[PDB]
Structures are given as C-alpha cells and as structure tokens.
Amino acid sequence: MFERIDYYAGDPILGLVEKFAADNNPDKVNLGIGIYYDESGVMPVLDCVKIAEQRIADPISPRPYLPMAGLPGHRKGCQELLFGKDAPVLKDGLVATIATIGGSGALKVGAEFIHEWFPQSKCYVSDPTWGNHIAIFEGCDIEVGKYPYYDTATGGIKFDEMIAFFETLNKDDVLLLHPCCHNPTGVDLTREQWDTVLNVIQERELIPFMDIAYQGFGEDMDSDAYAIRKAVDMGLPLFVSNSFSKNLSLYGERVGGLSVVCPTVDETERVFGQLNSTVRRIYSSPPSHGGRVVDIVMNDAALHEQWVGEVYAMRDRIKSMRTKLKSVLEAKISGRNFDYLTAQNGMFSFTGLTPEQVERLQSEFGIYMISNSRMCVAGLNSSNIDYVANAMVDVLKD
Amino acid sequence: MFERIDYYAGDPILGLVEKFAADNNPDKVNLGIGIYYDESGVMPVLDCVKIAEQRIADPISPRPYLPMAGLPGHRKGCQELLFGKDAPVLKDGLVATIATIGGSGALKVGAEFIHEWFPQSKCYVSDPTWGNHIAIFEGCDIEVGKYPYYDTATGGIKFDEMIAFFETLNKDDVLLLHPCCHNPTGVDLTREQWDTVLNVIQERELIPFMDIAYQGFGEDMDSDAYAIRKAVDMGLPLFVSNSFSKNLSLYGERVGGLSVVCPTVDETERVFGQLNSTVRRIYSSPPSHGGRVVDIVMNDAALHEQWVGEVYAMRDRIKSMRTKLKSVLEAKISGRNFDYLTAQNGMFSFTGLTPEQVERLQSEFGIYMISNSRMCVAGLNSSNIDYVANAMVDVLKD
Ligand SMILES: Cc1ncc(COP(=O)(O)O)c(C=O)c1O
Ligand SMILES: O=C(O)[C@@H](O)Cc1ccc(O)cc1
Ligand SMILES: O=C(O)[C@@H](O)Cc1ccc(O)cc1
Ligand SMILES: [Mg+2]
Ligand SMILES: [Mg+2]
C-alpha cells in the first residue's frame, strides 16, 4: 500500500545528536543544538515561569478550547513586546495578532496565508539560514530561493550584493528576515543597514517577514526589535513571527505569535479573520497551558520585569562565553582578529572554522559543531570553556 | 495592500455562541456547542487528569522539545486504546502513530500526507458532517465531496444509496468515516452495516480514514472502536484520527493522535518517517503539557481505570438525558415516535426540528441549536431539561 512512500532522512541536527550521544569520549561537548543551557549545562526553568505554572496549578481549572487566535493576553504580550507598549500602531489597531504553536507555527500560518492570497509571491531566505524556514514555506507550495547574506571571505555581510539582489525581486515577493541574532551565523545588520534594506523593501514593494526567535539575546528587548519597529514607522506591510521557545525556556509548550501589520483597521480585520480561518484549517486552536504561561508572565508587571532580567542574564552569559572564548584565542593566536566572535549576536556563531577543522574537533576532542562551522554559544560554560577554546587553538594552529 | 483579502465569516458554531451570549433571556440555554458539561452545566475537570497534573507540577520540570511524533507513552496510549491492549497489529509493529494537536491536527497531518503521496485521491465526507472536516481537507488542496448518509425521511441512514455511491468511486479515494457518535446527527451504523461498508471499501480498494472524536461516548471504549478493529482485522490500510478533547475533557491542551495501519513493518517505517517530516513542516512538535497528561493517564493502570470510569459516567449521563427528553416528548405528543432520540449515540442529536422550529426555540425560549436541528445533549441537565423538553413540545405543536 505504502511502497510508493520514500523514507524520511530525519532532522539533520538530530542526526548529529545521535552521534554525539553514542560518542564515548568522556570530555565530549555538544555545541550543535540551538538550545540554551545555563551555567551548569542544563536547560533552565525560569523563575517567572515556575511562578506562572504554580498559579496555573492552583487551582487546576477546566480546559475549554482557547480562541483560535489564542488568549488575548498572549496576543497583547506579543504585540507589546514586539512593537513597544502602547505603540501607536497598536493604539491605532493596525496589528492583527494570533498565538501560534511556537515560532514554527507562526511561520506556517503566515506562509499559508501568503500562499493563498499572494499565490505569485516567492520567498527568499538568507544564505545561509535555519533549515526549517525552507521546509515550512515549501511545504506551503511557495517557491523558495536565497538572498546573499553571509560573506565567507570577511565573515561579514555581502551588503552591496544583498541590496542589489532585492532590486531584482517582484512586487509582493517575500523576504525572510532576522531582526537580530542570526541563525546560524550570529552576524547581524547594523541599524544603518536595516534602513537601506527596508528602504529598498519599500521601493520594490516587497513583503518583509521578520522571524525573531531570540528577542532579548542580542542587545536588549527594544534594540532587538529595531528592524520590526522601523518597518512599522515606514508603513511597510510587515509579518512578524515570534517565538518564546528560547527566551521563556518553554520549547515543549509551543508558544509563539504571528503578527501582521496593516495599513488600515479594516484591512486589520480582514487579515485577522483570515488568520483565524487558516488556524481553523490546520489545528483549530492553540494549547492552553503554554498560552496561559505567556499570558501570566507577559501581563503581570512583576513577572514581566523578572522575566526580562532572566533573559538578560541568559544573554549576558552568552556574551561572557563569547568574550572568554575570544580572550583565550587572541591571547594564544597572534595576528588573527577574533573580534567577529563578540561582534556576532545571539546563541549562534559562525566560527570561521573550515569543515575539516569542525570534523577534527569531533574526532580529537569529542566537540560537536555543524559542518558550516555553526556553534551554539550556550553549549559553552565555565566547566567546558577552557577545554573547548584550547582545542580550537590547536585545530587552528595546525 | 490587503483589499484582496476577503472577510472571514467566522466559525458558524462560534457565531451562534456569540448571539447566545448577547441574548438577555434569563432562561437561555446553549445546546449549540459540542462541549461536554456535567450535571451542574460546567465543564468538568476529571479526577484522573487532576492527578496527572499534580504529578506534572511536582516538580516543575525543564521543557525541552518533545519528539516530532510526541511522547512515546502518548503514542502507545492512542494505540492501545484504539486497537486494544497489546493487540496483534501492535505486537506486529504495523501501526505508525504520532501525537497530534488534537483530532484536528491529526486530520491535518493525515490529509497532507494523502495529498502529497496520493495526489489523485479525492475525499468524501458524510452528508451531513462536522464543518471542519471539509475545511481541513480542502485546505490541503484535496477535492472534497459528499457521500449519502443521513436520511431526512426516516431519520436513519440511506444505507443502500451510500453503498451504491461507494461503488462508483476510484481506487485510493478517501472516505472520512465516524466509527461512532456521529456529528452532527448522532446516527450510527450498526455493526452489520459496518461489515458491509468495509467489504465494499476492501473490494473498491478505497482508503478509509476513521475520525473518532468521542471514543467512550457511544456504547463504551471497545464497542466504539469496532469499525476500527474490524478494518484492521480485514487487513485494510486504515488512517485513524483520535481526540482526547471530550473524553479527557482536555479541549484546550490539544491532544489527539493519528494512526496509520500498514500491511508490513517496512511500510510502517516509511509512513512513520513521512509523518514526522509532515509534522516538521507544520508546527515542529506537539505541546508537552497535554502530551504528559495523556502519557500519565493512559499508562498508569490506576489512572486509566479511573479514566474509563469517568467516561462511563459521562456517557451514562448523556444517555439519561436522551431518555428523559424522549419521555417528556412522547408523554406530551401523540402519534410521533421519538425512539430516534435514544437510538442516536454520542454527544449529538439531529432533533428532527425544522429551521423554523429551531429559530422559534431561540426567539421564544432563548434555546440555541444549529439550524440543521443539531443539539448537544450534554448541554441538557436536570436543571434545564423540563424547560427545554417542554419548549420543544410547543414548537412541534404549531
Ligand atoms: C468529529 C470530530 N472530528 C474532529 C474534531 C477535532 O477537534 P479537536 O482538535 O479538539 O480534537 C472534532 C471536534 O472538534 C470532532 O467533533
Ligand atoms: O536550530 C536548531 O538547532 C534547532 O532547530 C534544533 C531542533 C530542530 C528541530 C527539532 O524538532 C528540535 C530541535
Ligand atoms: O463540534 C463542535 O461544535 C465544536 O466543539 C467544534 C469547535 C471547537 C472549538 C473551536 O475553537 C472551534 C470549533
Ligand atoms: Mg499545501
Ligand atoms: Mg535607489
């Protein structure tokens, strides 16, 4: 019956993970998975979350369906976070927002909405980018290409080429953009580059789709959202997928948001209604437990403030790891610039190591990265840092 | 920018609900929504669930991604529930199962899988059926039509016409079937009619997709799954979507399962891999909280046994309401047979009332049903029964 069905290769990042677990090097370290670990190398449970969940468990309540858009408080928290509290765009009612099944789920609904209403649009992703972006869009029968982004030569951005690329695109074509904390490179646009980008986006009447999965891990909650807010100030029709997976340490509950910025309230209502309809077609409504956590933590002022602090500690710890890793490298290797390590933002780092060097890191030290050199900085901690930094010096010295 | 966007009419079931809320009749009752309510007119929190959730909160754990297929325990609970404890088909490893975002999510994944690998297959739904079935399938770009089912004349099933219809269909065409507890009619097939249909499905080489959203609300857990188990016995390739929304009273947490019965272990693996790949491109993985609940409740023998007991009481209560409703009607309306009310199974009932009568039921009494005459029996309880039964008497006499 199902002889025609091909085997599924399996998630690539998961394929590596099997190999690491198998590895019997006592000193093995996994830096391959984009998961945040704390000082002790474990996934944290955030204090604010813990508190939110005790409230949810006290008392244990009936579990009616959430609305299709999810909880209003969840929606508002997304909005206030992304566009700023009582931002003009929100007080004008020009943002249609739904809770989603994580950032993935927001990408799916947004892509499906684009596919239905802008059937001609293509989508373009950064070269390189997070593998799942491509699957989600193509899974909607939207054609996906790549725009120039990362400059292998410099470690920077092929900014000129990227800009020239965008001018070739068709009206209503979609750009998948990372407002900060690029996955996998860590290399972000400066504000001035954002203004040029958004300028051409405006001129070419392209659709910007900002995926922000690490708000708070780059500069701060506001800064990380500059690209979003500047697109709003310019009056662009912006799609924003956001995820709480990382910054809430709530990967498994599937919490995120999708927001569509619209030129008029009436368009806001058309789009909101169609987002609902799209949700109804896929999974009907989002999960109550994850949504309640988001609702409680975003809208309780004491919990929100605690939560930002918790995110900033996670960001600060990742920044310390970057600094420490650079300090060892620059102390030990003269005449190579390692500023790109602290210039990069978020959880990810393109190390600049060649595939052969990544592989030698695996064999010789049991240290696991992606072949494109991507390292998750949160994998690093006080207990493994000197071992990893020193292994890296060795591989680069050969 | 979004003037091309059509307004979404809104979920009809949800649309009626708003009119009810707005309604200022002191004695209003809502029988429009397929939600289960206890004797007091409130959504229950089941004891087993409450226990499962105390275990989940003690202690509050890290929240990593579940696997794409969800928790193994959740997958095994679906399987055992659907096909019977340690069934041959399970011991033979011929069932590919994933957790899903409710029954809706399972429908979506199985419809996407069908669309990808059997692009020619069309899907046929019962006339009438639950509104979302169509949207889910059409949302996958699968063409959907209807098979004869409900007989307006007799209140039964146009069984002969249905069977003739199935014989016209192409090989690999999909039938969406309700093992029990038909929505919206309440009218089910007998076991003998099941044997006939599944025979024709076998001879016409059609694909049965069984959606069972109310296991436990018909006769009992095992009886309700007859159509499923008989299809397995016959060696048919079967798709089953199951939902814990009602029978676990866990609508909000989005818990259900998709199961694909395969002729051989190797095909089981192919299908299992692609199900995962399909999950990846939609929402990446399912929610932990809901999945943990299902895991704990299905796999703890004391909780499972308690849980069956809880569903039994819910079913018995619905059955009592059917009997009391019929008794009032037959006592007060001469020469109309109302055995169809007790003959129907599950939460829903096609009351036989015309759209005019349904609408008069709204205007005169604030009693809300679907225009097609669908009533949710769980909406009825000892506090509202007489009032609803007696109002129904008056609409029928005019
Ligand atoms: C017959 C039927 N199938 C599928 C579903 C999907 O619901 P859920 O996603 O909550 O399991 C429902 C209920 O909403 C239903 O009544
Ligand atoms: O960026 C990453 O490494 C994550 O995307 C890893 C991942 C991907 C899929 C998944 O089901 C679990 C983890
Ligand atoms: O069968 C019914 O009437 C409803 O239970 C379906 C439903 C449930 C929740 C929802 O957000 C939309 C439709
Ligand atoms: Mg499609
Ligand atoms: Mg110019």
Residue numbers in the entry:
A (entry chain A), B (entry chain B): 1 to 398
What do the authors say?
In the catalytic center of both complexes, the Arg280* switch was in the “down” position; however, in the case of PsyArAT/YOH, it was placed a little deeper than in the PsyArAT/FOH complex. In the subunit A, Arg280*, which was pushed down by a YOH ligand, made two hydrogen bonds between guanidine moiety nitrogen atoms and carboxyl oxygens of Asp11 (2.8 Å and 3.5 Å).
PsyArAT exhibits an activity typical for ArAT: transamination, which is a transfer of an amine group between aromatic α-amino acids and α-ketoacids. The mechanism of active site adjustment toward substrates of psychrophilic aromatic amino acid aminotransferase (PsyArAT) from Psychrobacter sp.
